Amino acid sequence: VQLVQSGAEVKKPGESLTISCKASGYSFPNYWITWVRQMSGGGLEWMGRIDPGDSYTTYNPSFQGHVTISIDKSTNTAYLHWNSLKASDTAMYYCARYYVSLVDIWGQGTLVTVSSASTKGPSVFPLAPSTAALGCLVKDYFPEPVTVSWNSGALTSGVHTFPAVLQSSGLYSLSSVVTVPSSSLGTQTYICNVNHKPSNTKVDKKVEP
Amino acid sequence: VLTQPASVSGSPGQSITISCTGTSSDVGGYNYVSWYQQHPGKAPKLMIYDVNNRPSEVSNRFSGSKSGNTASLTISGLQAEDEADYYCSSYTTGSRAVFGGGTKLTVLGQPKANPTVTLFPPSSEELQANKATLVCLISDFYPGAVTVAWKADGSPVKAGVETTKPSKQSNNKYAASSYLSLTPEQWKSHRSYSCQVTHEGSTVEKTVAP
């Protein structure tokens, strides 16, 4: 039983937005589908529930008229739709199976960032060895997130991608450090793969002394 | 919103209790009270349902109680892994549902750990673009409070400093970052720059030089 949610979304206030939730592994018309919102640093907020047998919905009054929950019984899909987004809608949204009184199965969550600021792609610089610690500075990007891999996924040990800093410019910086034997520095290539989906940025930098 | 304490703490082996006070349209009109555990970067996991019922994947250390419009979640043999956020849910009149504000459970026995500081100077690729940035990476510290100070030749640097709030790692220790943005001329003028990290009264310094 999986509830697969749609990808992350970077939008601007006033734009429409539809996020989806595909259910699989059970009889869809027999369980309710609920939507739960959680802001960054905040708590869980119930938004509404829908019965996919007859599309009957119930909403939290604070969200009624601002968002719409809908169902597609032919495709086992649940939809959450905004006609006009607000910056206060920036949050993570989970779809979840609701059975009588509990919430048993959750989705992975869809991150929705609503900002009038511009998507900016990062600048990648190598933090060179001077055990040794190599790294990569990911500088000036919006919005979050950035993902950093080393060696196309082969270097997973010693990898610490430190958390990002929101700078005064309104942009973010991040640093990823891999600790390596100081004897491989001359015999082993170390490449940082920086991926920033909001800007469609994908860069690879080789870190050399 | 159901009312929960903002924070609750305890020691390993001890038994802690989290309250959840609602009205009679939620906790006091139904026996449908659910308890959820959420770890950072994870979705919530059902811990207790129907007031006292417990699912099969939950240790018997987790019990539920209801007393009027107040519900209660008890955790008996405290482990470090129990440190998370705990949310109560209730079924409300009109086929609605309601969540609580959240309780941060803290396990109060973790051992003091000193921070490791790694300081990276600006890269040539960045100085070529007429930019300079020094990077201080602070790792493996507990508790999660640090002070960062930058010095150029011993003199306190005032501007260009951007520091993160401490954040928990996989080892239950804390990590932080400090970035000092400089122009290439400032970077090439001073003999040395230092990042000083103060934690629990002790200061650890790292230095770089062009």
Numbering used by the authors:
A (entry chain H): 2 to 131, 139 to 217
B (entry chain L): 3 to 212
Q: What does the original paper state about this entry?
A:
Whereas traditional therapeutic antibodies have been limited to extracellular antigens, T cell receptor mimic (TCRm) antibodies can target intracellular antigens presented by cell surface major histocompatibility complex (MHC) proteins. We previously engineered and described a TCRm that detects an HLA-A*02-presented peptide derived from alpha fetoprotein (AFP). AFP is a biomarker for hepatocellular carcinoma (HCC), the fourth leading cause of global cancer deaths with a mortality rate of almost 100%14. In prior work, this TCRm displayed high specificity and showed no evidence of off-target recognition.
We also determined the crystallographic structures of the unbound TCRm and AFP/HLA-A*02 complex. Although the resolutions of these structures were lower than that of the complex, electron density was clear enough to show that, in contrast with many TCR-pMHC interactions, there were no large conformational changes seen in either molecule outside of changes in side chain rotamers, small rigid body shifts of the TCRm variable domains, and slight remodeling of CDR1H. The rigid interaction between TCRm and AFP/HLA-A*02 likely further contributes to high specificity and affinity, as more flexible interactions between TCRs and their ligands have been associated with higher degrees of cross-reactivity.
